[PDB]
Structure 1
Amino acid sequence: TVIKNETGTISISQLNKNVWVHTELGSFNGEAVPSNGLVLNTSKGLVLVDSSWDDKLTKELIEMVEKKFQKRVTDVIITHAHADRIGGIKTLKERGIKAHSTALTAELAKKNGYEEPLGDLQTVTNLKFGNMKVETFYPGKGHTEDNIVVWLPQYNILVGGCLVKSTSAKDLGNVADAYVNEWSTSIENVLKRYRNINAVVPGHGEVGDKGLLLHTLDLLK
């Protein structure tokens, strides 16, 4: 169920046979916070949805999953250019792990001093790893200008990233790079595209369902 790792904590929790949620604790003085991502166990290797806060955590995460599932992490999908998502890009690049992203996320990463992910993802991109099907979708601006969501069609699981707030989120969090007037439409775009959702993974907090999208629409009011 929940597999842990000490100091600067990393934890993985299984959702289904081949889908796990990775959660790491990132803390800089007074703010402290656990972000989420996915670990996809495919027949072709491990695929991660998002890396982690920094390189130190990213290495630990990779090492933890490689040892457990007995296969290499081959690809990573970066959902937006902020640190909790792209902080481990250097580790991914030096280890030969493919870092997928939209051209805009790549640009923004480069603009902010990070190494560049691939910039290969379009508005809708369908990938397949082993037998695992993965769809990436840019619904428009919200938490950031570039935020994308990730959909697993075989399980109807949606990784909302930071565009989606958990039940425990009582506010919009960091809106410095946000588009609060477009965020609602972007969320509506996700609801329209995926009318039948089984689970929704927020960028931070507990896993939920379509309700988390409705919760975010309310926070935007």
Structure 2
Amino acid sequence: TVIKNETGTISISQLNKNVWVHTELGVPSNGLVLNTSKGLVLVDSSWDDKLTKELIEMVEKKFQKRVTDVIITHAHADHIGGIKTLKERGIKAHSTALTAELAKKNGYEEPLGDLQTVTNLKFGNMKVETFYPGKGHTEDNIVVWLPQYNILVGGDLVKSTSAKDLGNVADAYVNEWSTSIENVLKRYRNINAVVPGHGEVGDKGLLLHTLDLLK
């Protein structure tokens, strides 16, 4: 079930009753839309305010609920870029302290810096755990786990099958990235789906693929 917007710039495919993948062309970036009984929760918004606004507006209309929260999985422009939109609309922008301070350092408005190494959030019925596994794609990258579905949002820590290299490594810690991936595999031993930062949803295999890319 793939719902595109007017432009085809934004696309959402359903994973289950309450979890959707959002994908925007900026190179396609993935995030999640969590349809919860208390509103919509995004795992990552989009590249900039324009797309973040279109994203929110598309999901709010479709699901007939407000976006209440977003989880920002790292401070890169393409993840933090819609922060202005989130803050001015009173959408809670969750992040680790490190992501927030990187955002501030890079001139972005700050997300909450409320996430710890492991943080468990609950939005209505929807359970969400955020996990900082260590440095990888960036020093601050986190993953997001939906324990009710065993769905892992890998963000840019995790490369899709189609990714034949590590992408942008300017901010990366290619020595620690393998350990960070291991930390994810150790923590989540039973994974139903993994959503990479870009590309097609996969499973545990994407974490193995990322490991190989790191050799």
Q: TM-score range by the shorter chain?
A: over 0.9
Equivalent residues of 1:168, 1:205 under 8 A apart: yes
What is the CA distance between 1:84 and its match in structure 2?
1.5
What is the CA distance between 1:8 and its match in structure 2?
6.4
- Could you tell me which residue of structure 1 aligns to residue 109 of structure 2? 115
**1:46 counterpart (37, 40, 62):** 40
Pairwise CA RMSD: 0.6
What is the CA distance between 1:2 and its match in structure 2?
0.3
CA distance in 2, matches of 1:14, 1:8: 16
**1:174 counterpart (160, 165, 168):** 168
CA distance in 2, matches of 1:83, 1:36: 14
Q: C-alpha deviations, 1:95-135, integer Å up to 9, x for none?
A: 00000000000000000000000000000000000000000
What is the CA distance between 1:60 and its match in structure 2?
0.4
Q: C-alpha deviations, 1:28-83, integer Å up to 9, x for none?
A: xxxxxx00000000000000000100000000000000001000000000000012
What is the CA distance between 1:7 and its match in structure 2?
3.0
Q: C-alpha deviations, 1:118-161, integer Å up to 9, x for none?
A: 00000000000000000000000000000000000000000000
SS in 1 for 2:16: coil
SS in 2 for 1:184: helix
CA distance in 1, matches of 2:6, 2:64: 21
Identity of paired residues, percent?
99
- Could you tell me which residue of structure 2 aligns to residue 9 of structure 1? 9
CA distance in 1, matches of 2:198, 2:182: 20
What is the CA distance between 1:6 and its match in structure 2?
3.2
SS in 1 for 2:153: strand
SS in 2 for 1:7: coil
What aligned pairs does 1:1-221 form with structure 2 within 5 A after superposition?
1-7=1-7, 9-26=9-26, 34-221=28-215
Aligned residue pairs total 214
CA distance in 2, matches of 1:208, 1:158: 10
CA distance in 1, matches of 2:7, 2:214: 35
Equivalent residues of 1:156, 1:197 under 8 A apart: yes
Equivalent residues of 1:8, 1:57 under 8 A apart: no
Q: C-alpha deviations, 1:170-218, integer Å up to 9, x for none?
A: 0000000000000000000000000000000000000000000000000
SS in 1 for 2:60: helix
Long gaps (5+) in structure 1: 27-33
List, as ranges, runs of 4+ consecutive aligned residues in structure 1 with deviation greater than 3 Å: none
CA distance in 1, matches of 2:162, 2:77: 22
